[PDB]
Structures are given as structure tokens and as C-alpha cells.
Enzyme design. Sequence first.
Site, mmCIF file in Angstrom:
data_model
loop_
_atom_site.group_PDB
_atom_site.id
_atom_site.type_symbol
_atom_site.label_atom_id
_atom_site.label_comp_id
_atom_site.label_asym_id
_atom_site.label_seq_id
_atom_site.Cartn_x
_atom_site.Cartn_y
_atom_site.Cartn_z
ATOM 1 N N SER A 1 3.548 2.582 8.318
ATOM 2 C CA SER A 1 3.266 1.540 7.366
ATOM 3 C C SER A 1 4.578 1.058 6.687
ATOM 4 C CB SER A 1 2.423 2.032 6.142
ATOM 5 O OG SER A 1 1.131 2.294 6.568
ATOM 6 N N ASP B 1 -0.839 -7.366 1.753
ATOM 7 C CA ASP B 1 -0.254 -5.987 1.749
ATOM 8 C C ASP B 1 1.266 -6.195 1.913
ATOM 9 O OD1 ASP B 1 0.014 -3.467 1.628
ATOM 10 O OD2 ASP B 1 -0.559 -3.045 3.736
ATOM 11 N N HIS C 1 0.814 -1.234 0.000
ATOM 12 C CA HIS C 1 0.000 0.000 0.000
ATOM 13 C C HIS C 1 0.839 1.272 0.000
ATOM 14 C CE1 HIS C 1 -0.093 -0.009 4.472
ATOM 15 N NE2 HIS C 1 0.035 1.278 4.211
#
Lengths: 10, 36, 253
Positions: free
Chosen positions: C199, C99, C43
Site C-alpha cells: 500500500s 485514498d 490509509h
Amino acid sequence: DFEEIPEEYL
Amino acid sequence: TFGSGEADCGLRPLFEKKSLEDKTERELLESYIDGR
Amino acid sequence: IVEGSDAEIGMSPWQVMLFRKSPQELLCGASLISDRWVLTAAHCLLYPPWDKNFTENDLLVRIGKHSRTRYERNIEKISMLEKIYIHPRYNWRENLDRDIALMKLKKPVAFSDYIHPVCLPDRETAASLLQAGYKGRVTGWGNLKETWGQPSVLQVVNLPIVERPVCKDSTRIRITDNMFCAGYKPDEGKRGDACEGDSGGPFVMKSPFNNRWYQMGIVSWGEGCDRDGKYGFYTHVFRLKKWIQKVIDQFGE
């Protein structure tokens, strides 16, 4: 804010 | 790289390697019902 | 990281910064699993809804960093990516299942006191450690506040793995087997979470058996940061491992 990096890199 | 990592993988030069323990590692090991 | 602490020097040597050439900025965390391979969340690279689609070009990798902002003169190594590989079945469309993304560095990084790969979990490591209650660690230069600061130094936080049912009932989103959630329960009066800019970073566990650090999860998603009755969702690294193996001995190191 961010310092600058050598454009040996950019 | 892969298969249970790199080689010397996950052995930190400033910690595991000099037999130094970071400040909270113990909390981790103590959740695994104390490490080894 | 919300309710973490500054990382000690060399505490997370595999920690990587995904950095934007222009504008010059921190896009995500990531990690070194070899001298030429970096593990991140897909992502951080691809997000159609947000029109996000970083190319090998648009980016830089910064390894060995302590400081968020300064160029760490003779300690940090900055690389250029040779290639990007996103998981063929990464679901940006619904829940970000798979992901995960690999990055092949244009040239191999040399290890030093501040730069060292984390290990990938073998099926047994995964089995013995990925348990509800067991604590793992998250690192990043992300948000300190869901909303308001920004750390000047790498932050750390130790989070317990939360059993599946709890993860499931905490959200409306569809949780998959390629996911695990982490976080304290409101009952627990202990806080912490990954936040914006976190992230792609590593969720690592220290093996009690061989005393090595393994990367179990990838900072994937959550709702807000450090909210009650909510948890962080991480990519289940061991489950996506064959995919990982595949791409490394296909076109890699």
C-alpha cells in the site's frame, strides 16, 4: 529482522 | 512536483539516462501496442 | 508483491519506504514526485477502524533502498517529515475513495542514481495510457503470500488495467471514478498482485511518447492477494491531481 538505523534519524 | 511531474521526472539515471532498458519494460511498451 | 521478481538496482528510483520509528517497521510503500514531496495512500496514515493514526512524528521516510531490511549505508537517505496532508474527502468509512496523502519532507532529498522522482500524469498522458489491457508496474517490499514470505529485495510486477465493469463485478464494494483495478483475469494464466506492505506504492506506466515514467495509480486495496476473479484497486492519480497541485503551491516546494 530489520537492521537498526542511526538515531541521528531516530 | 506536479504538472506532468518534476522536471527530469521519470528519467532514470541507470536506465533512460544511459539508454539502458530494464528487463521487463518491453512487456509494458508491448501492451501499448509497442512504444514509440 | 505476489508473483513478482526482484527489482533491478535503480529500476524504481522514486520508490519510498514508509517506516515506523518504534516499533521499527515497514508500514507502506510511497513515492517521490519532487525533492521534498512524497505520494502515499491516506490509509497508511489514517485508519480509525484499525485505530491507525500516524503523526508526522511516528514516522520515517527511506529513499534509495533496494533491501527491505538493511540500512543501506551510503545509498539510502532517510528523512523526517515536516508535514502530512490527507485528502479532505478520503472515505475510510466506506470504500477508501480518495485514498491519497502527501508528505512534505523536513528537508529536500538530493537525487542520485538510486533516488529520482517519478512524473505526475498530465490529462493527456492519462487519456492515452489508462486503458484496459495496458500494462502498468507495481513495486513494493510487501507480502509475497496473501498468507503463509517476505522479500529481502524490492519486488516488481507488470499488471494489465482491467475494464471498469469487470472491476465492478469482482466485488460487493462500491467502486468510484477515483479508482481503477488492475490484475490478470483467471482466464489469463498470468498472476500477480500487491500484498500487505505494498500500500501507498506506485502503479507506474512508461510513456511511449516521451519515454518517461508516470505514476498513474497508488496501491490502494484488494481482497486477499492474488486471488482468482479478484483485482487490485488503485487510487486514480490524475483524477486527484488538482488536489495535489493545490497542496503543493499552498505550503510546499
